Design a protein around this ligand. Structure first.
Ligand SMILES: COc1cc2cc(c1Cl)NC(=O)C[C@H](O)/C(C)=C/[C@H](C)[C@@H](O)CC(=O)[C@H](OC)/C=C/C=C(\C)C2
Ligand SMILES: COc1cc2cc(c1Cl)NC(=O)C[C@H](O)/C(C)=C/[C@H](C)[C@@H](O)CC(=O)[C@H](OC)/C=C/C=C(\C)C2
Ligand SMILES: Nc1ncnc2c1ncn2[C@@H]1O[C@H](COP(=O)(O)O)[C@@H](O)[C@H]1O
Ligand SMILES: Nc1ncnc2c1ncn2[C@@H]1O[C@H](COP(=O)(O)O)[C@@H](O)[C@H]1O
Ligand SMILES: [Fe+3]
Ligand SMILES: [Fe+3]
Lengths: 678, 674
């Protein structure tokens, strides 16, 4: 019994189903494989096509999952899609009425055309099962908790008909207790408010990160006008007929005006974020007080995108309403795609469930066999120096105690938004200066947000208040208070309110990463490390080896530890050996605008990525001529000869383009088909 | 007392307040000037920037309006805006949250910046009055009716808070009687349905022209699921939570598939249109039947964008609910902008009103004087031959009787979407083949589209069934039955259901157009002409003399009659003498996508217009280099030298760009001030 789980839209690599398809129309594409009850493989498509939260069809993800399970496509017994057919097809129909040139292809035809053309897989109609969206979430959240029964709460932006659902789960039976209609969406409320802060979809975690810097009483009475707590765990959100945003009209009427790009955060912005977060907490705790009493249950599984609010999840932990609480590492739509697999298996015969509780998100493709990895690092030789220590973990620990900031890349990639010891950036958690050091120089982001600690299972309670209920801390789902005595020790990983989004690593969740943090603590007396995702501002978490090396060379990390190899950037690296390739979404443009006196105006040359919200950059006329000659095999140095050679100016310009990921730059060939190891 | 009426958004000529601002965010930009209660000038900005239903700020319209009034900006006592200040600023604020680079500039600052940079006009805060949207509609509709009391009904998509308002008007007082909220919008429903036929905003009257070919029975019971008539003039529309469109989810579920662009109009499409049209008629007539007997008024003024549904109007006329109906020639948001002036004059002092019913929509800029028009037609000499007959109207009537299709350009242009003998294309209304060919060869549009007749006042009741209430027909507001014994005689202008959207012209509404129609009837026996708007499918109604000539040369019209000059195309027109100039929205692009094996794809070259829903076109490498050298003064012939001469392939390719209006092609210089 081998079941594929799908979520996301149906766009190909190089175009969208309709032009410039909105980034919110079925985002976080991913594929998932279950074999007789167990999650064998799962990767988000963003990791492979390199587009954060991509809406594109997850064809690569499916190919990666089949190969990790050793299956032909024809081996698959059923496919499950995370939304009911009529719902996705009605949304597609609406996109088609606004773009009258798009052919009328709905999801069943589009799903099958992608699999037939991209994999040779001739999918029979009887194997495609569409699933209720919150049902998908709930299966994913509950079947991996290792619980025998629980109250299941699902809260996201919206499914087909609801923005919230409550389930009782027992064995493998889901039974629905309640729902909340779409207009009441807390996902929607959060995202609306995020727009007022100059941010957009996928920046909610930044808003949550900013809220401790703010005072929730400044705008408490303002938000009070937008919601009402009612009896029996009901609430209303108060809409308006002005604009499709719950929050902006009222706040505009009181003089709040939204933040501009590159504007610093004011005290009003900080307070807004605090009051926003206190509202969502206040409402979600109101739902849960009622359903914990009405159902009498002591265990909670919380799912949906709202369940990536670490701050909310810690408040639930310390509320005293439950004894255990579980949150899946991928509680957003990528997990609904996994849960769609289980629901398809229950729809089609019997449903087999996971053995025990999920401890490791390490479910993606791996970096490769050590023969490949050594061979590939040799292709990168003109840019890197590479050692092979006897104990990489042992070496890496000392480096961290010395003060180095490390890239840590091992095994299969983490499913979901958190890096957990497989695609991480690692450094000592004690120096409070490491925040501005890493959160600016090396990775290039915003410094108001503290970093996440990783602690050992053994010393965990000697640093953090993991009390209240028993939550799962293997995936950083809960923000917990840092013990006030240890707060000054942990300067890099403690917020202004004293809390921290803690990963607790054990020998069962991650042996190599546990040895690393333990060793470091034996050498320092502090078995806590800082743990952030291995990616710069312009990419999702890195996936392939080439991904990892690219990201290391284009950031300011000291050392890279990748599958026991130590990697440092050479004296002066030879960019000219890198072979430039276009990404499927790369576009290279010469533009004329209108000019004064109705003339042909300013000639500019630009590179950009063709997808909604994609970046763009001006280029010089020489880069334009060089880039246009890119054939996907010739190296940068050889292409540079048609414009006079790779000068330092050109190579600096190309390097800045590489940083922003407008095109692939990597040595000739590739690592080859990923190894089989056991 | 000189008051400016404003409506539209606040974008400059070459950019929008946010990038790719949607075509429905405050469309139909226009400016109106009232003086002593008389409407002395009014023009839609679309006529001047050549962007159909544009949202961009009506800067050029204000300037043209002051010129027509002989006024300076300092002469203006007040400016009205057709929406309340909090509403437009809240919507601006929404767009800004979605585009964090846009500076926070709200409407008052943007109106003042536009008037100051564009006209040297420091408008004071105390002179800018914002107006409730349906109040602005009602004033415009009612004050031009000639009536001293009426029921005034305003239906559009939405004002600030309502989709419909009902008023009582007595003297110059408006008294609100009722309103319908925004989610009951009938204009919203019509637009929603329109999107299912492969059309978009601005195409609603094509759907209404398609309706008569359909059977409203097929989908009556489906549309019945989307509304409920309730007691005492109330109704409900039934929404959904799936998509922001009220019609498509239910129709998808029943197997209806949205038409694609370029695909034929199937019978299911025609039936859908007919049902939609019947639905709106049943609702509006339900509203009107109630409010006619409740308010006691025998006279109705109908305004708001929905009042441009000629078929609905013809039904209101035949319903017997009223003795008199008036519809304004611009009942859509440009009329609201005019009404905003009346409402601002009433906020600051007393309201002076028109003394007569509006008979003529001829309210925009003219073509120019006698000698500046002769001189500018001479600049077109390499492309046109020109005759000056003793009696142009007499000559044009004979040409029409010999089967010629004429362009007709006289005087000040029509305010509102209809052409009424000032920017018209006309032909014999009798042969049914004229409908087939003017649809296929001239206007280049769908075969099912009807053509509107113009008839003299004296003969109207010989051809059309005007019976029922007395409505105003100077502006083609009412669809009326063509009398049964005349349908064969009027083959081109009788729609499939025996109706015509008729213009009754008189010596008082349009003396010269009336003379043309009267003389044609003396020559032929039929004082009726086909009268369609003078524009190809790429442009709004032609405004200026250059516009007229350009449109004439790029559509297949036989003869152009413009201000008593007979204009024909030369056998071999010399395009090389024309000076290419970019429009402010014109954009040239050389583009590479990805290609096989992650290579740079092959180059392509595009010209496009930079606005939401703007067209684009592929161009050759040679033409792409030629347009790169455009400087606004060099001729196309000299420009072509740098790619080896204006070959026939280039002239042909440029001609097709010109026909789609991607750039301006016209002789060196211009006509000058008028
Ligand atoms: C212009 O056309 C629109 C616009 C909106 C709504 C709909 C439509 Cl058709 N109607 C839907 O049904 C949306 C659909 O279900 C969907 C994209 C679901 C994904 C998988 C969730 O993630 C939705 C969200 O939660 C999203 O924020 C990310 C909120 C979006 C609101 C909107 C995008 C407003
Ligand atoms: C994504 O952002 C949206 C979207 C919609 C609504 C609003 C907003 Cl902010 N909110 C408003 O308030 C609309 C505003 O007042 C406005 C543009 C009024 C114009 C000038 C009138 O003409 C309205 C119509 O009649 C129009 O269809 C042509 C409505 C289309 C529906 C919509 C455009 C749906
Ligand atoms: N930290 C967060 N707090 C509140 N809402 C969030 C957070 N992260 C994501 N969401 C919302 O979750 C929804 C997407 O979840 P899903 O559809 O389950 O992927 C969107 O409405 C987001 O705004
Ligand atoms: N012939 C028509 N029938 C029905 N509604 C129309 C028609 N023409 C325009 N509208 C609607 O009127 C609204 C715009 O009017 P306004 O806002 O007054 O310019 C939109 O909702 C249009 O779809
Ligand atoms: Fe979800
Ligand atoms: Fe309106």
């Amino acid at each position: 019994m081998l079941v594929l789980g799908l979520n996301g839209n149906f766009s190909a690599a190089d175009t969208d189903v309709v032009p410039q398809l909105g980034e919110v129309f079925f985002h976080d594409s991913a594929a998932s494989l279950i074999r007789d009850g167990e999650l064998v493989a799962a990767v988000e498509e963003e990791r492979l096509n390199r587009i954060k939260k991509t809406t594109k069809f997850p064809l690569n993800a499916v190919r990666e999952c089949l190969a990790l399970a050793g299956a032909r496509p024809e081996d698959v017994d059923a496919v499950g899609y995370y939304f009911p057919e009529n719902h996705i097809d009605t949304v597609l129909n609406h996109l088609y009425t606004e773009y009258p040139r798009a052919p009328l292809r709905y999801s069943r035809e589009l799903i099958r055309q992608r699999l037939k053309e991209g994999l040779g897989w001739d999918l029979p109609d009887e194997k495609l099962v569409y699933v209720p969206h919150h049902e998908a979430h709930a299966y994913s959240s509950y079947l991996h908790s290792g619980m025998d029964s629980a109250l299941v709460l699902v809260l996201d932006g919206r499914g087909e008909l609801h923005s919230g659902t409550v389930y009782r789960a027992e064995g493998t039976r889901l039974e629905k207790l309640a729902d909340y209609p779409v207009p009441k969406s807390l996902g929607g409320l959060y995202l609306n408010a995020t727009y007022l802060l100059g941010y957009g979809f996928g920046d909610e975690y930044k808003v949550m990160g900013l809220a401790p810097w703010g005072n929730p009483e400044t705008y408490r009475d303002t938000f009070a006008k937008l919601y009402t707590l009612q009896d029996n765990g009901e609430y209303e959100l108060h809409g308006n007929i002005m604009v499709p945003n719950l929050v902006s009209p009222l706040f505009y009427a009181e003089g709040f005006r939204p933040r501009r790009k590159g504007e610093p955060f004011t005290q009003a912005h900080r307070d807004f974020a605090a009051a926003l977060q206190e509202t969502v907490e206040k409402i979600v705790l109101h739902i849960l007080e009622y359903w914990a009493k009405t159902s009498g249950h002591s265990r909670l599984c919380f799912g949906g995108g709202v369940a990536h609010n670490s701050s909310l999840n810690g408040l639930i932990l310390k509320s005293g309403l439950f004894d255990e609480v579980f949150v899946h590492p991928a509680s957003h739509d990528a997990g609904a795609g996994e849960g769609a697999a289980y629901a398809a298996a229950a729809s089609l015969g019997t449903l087999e469930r996971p053995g025990k509780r999920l401890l490791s998100a390490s479910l993606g493709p791996a970096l490769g066999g050590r023969e490949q990895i050594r061979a590939r690092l040799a292709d990168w030789a003109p840019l890197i120096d590479v050692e092979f220590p006897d104990d990489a973990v042992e070496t890496a620990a000392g480096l961290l105690a010395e003060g180095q900031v490390l890239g840590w890349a091992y095994g299969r990639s983490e499913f979901g938004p958190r890096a957990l010891g497989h695609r991480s950036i690692v450094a000592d958690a004690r120096p409070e200066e490491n925040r501005t050091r890493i959160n600016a120089m090396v990775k290039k982001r915003e410094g108001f947000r503290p970093f996440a600690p990783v602690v050992t299972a053994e010393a965990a309670r000697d640093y953090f208040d993991l009390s209240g209920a028993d939550g799962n801390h293997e995936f950083m789902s809960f923000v917990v208070p840092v013990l006030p005595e240890r707060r000054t020790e942990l300067g890099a990983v403690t917020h202004v309110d004293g809390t921290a989004r803690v990963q607790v690593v054990s020998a069962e969740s991650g042996e190599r990463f546990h040895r690393l943090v333990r060793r470091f603590g034996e050498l320092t007396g502090t078995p806590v490390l800082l743990n952030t995702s291995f990616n710069n501002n312009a990419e999702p978490i890195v996936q392939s080896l080439d991904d990892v090396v690219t990201s290391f060379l284009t950031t300011d990390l000291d050392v890279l530890v990748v599958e026991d190899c130590l990697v440092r950037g050479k004296a002066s690296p030879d960019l000219g050996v890198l072979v430039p390739r276009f990404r499927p979404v790369t576009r290279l443009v010469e533009r004329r605008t209108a000019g004064p006196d109705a003339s042909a105006g300013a000639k500019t040359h630009e590179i950009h990525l063709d997808y909604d919200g994609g970046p763009s950059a001006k280029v010089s006329p020489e880069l334009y001529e060089l880039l246009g000659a890119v054939d996907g095999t010739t190296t940068l140095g050889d292409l540079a000869k048609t414009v006079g050679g790779l000068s330092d100016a050109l190579a600096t310009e190309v390097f800045a383009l590489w940083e922003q990921r407008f095109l692939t730059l990597a040595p000739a060939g590739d690592i080859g088909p990923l190894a089989d190891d056991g």
